[PDB]
Swiss-Prot record:
Organism of this sequence: Mus musculus (Mouse)
Protein name from the UniProt record: Perforin-1
Disulfide bonds: C83-C96, C111-C120
Sites where the protein binds Ca(2+) 4: D72, D76, D78
Superkingdom of origin: Eukaryota
Subunit organization: Monomer, as soluble protein. Homooligomer; homooligomerizes to form a pore-forming ring.
Residue window of the full protein shown: 410 to 535 of 554
Effect ascribed to mutating D78N: Decreased calcium-binding
Length: 122
């Protein structure tokens, strides 16, 4: 099958998210899902998570979706914002502007052998 790649997403951090924020991320690609921990009381959080999505369909299986949530203990959490990317092969630094502030992360996408092209369709 064409369009297949290894996808690893990392180096998650956010800026100016507010007035106190308790942020965590949910990160999706196709049917797969990761969730980070909560950084309590911080408008510029960083998370150490490395998210290996292993083999994915880079073309059709997307998008890569990052949700930035504010944990509210004893109530419903607040969705601060969300962004989508259609990943391309290589190494990429993403900046997602939110209504307030932004979230940043990197990803590496490498086509499976005998595939090439920016979305591994060739
Ligand atoms: Ca809650």
């Amino acid at each position: 099958q064409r369009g297949l790649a290894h996808l690893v997403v990392s180096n998650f951090r956010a800026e100016h998210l507010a007035t106190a924020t308790d942020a965590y991320l949910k990160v999706f690609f196709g049917g797969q899902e990761f969730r980070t921990g909560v950084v309590w009381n911080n408008n510029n959080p960083r998370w150490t998570d490395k998210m290996d999505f292993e083999n994915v369909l880079l073309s059709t299986g997307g998008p890569l979706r990052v949700q930035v949530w504010d944990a509210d203990a004893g109530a419903d959490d607040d969705l601060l914002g969300s962004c989508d990317r259609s990943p391309h092969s290589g190494f990429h630094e993403v900046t997602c502007e939110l209504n307030h502030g932004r979230v940043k992360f990197s990803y590496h996408a490498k086509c499976l052998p005998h595939l090439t092209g920016g979305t591994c369709l060739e």
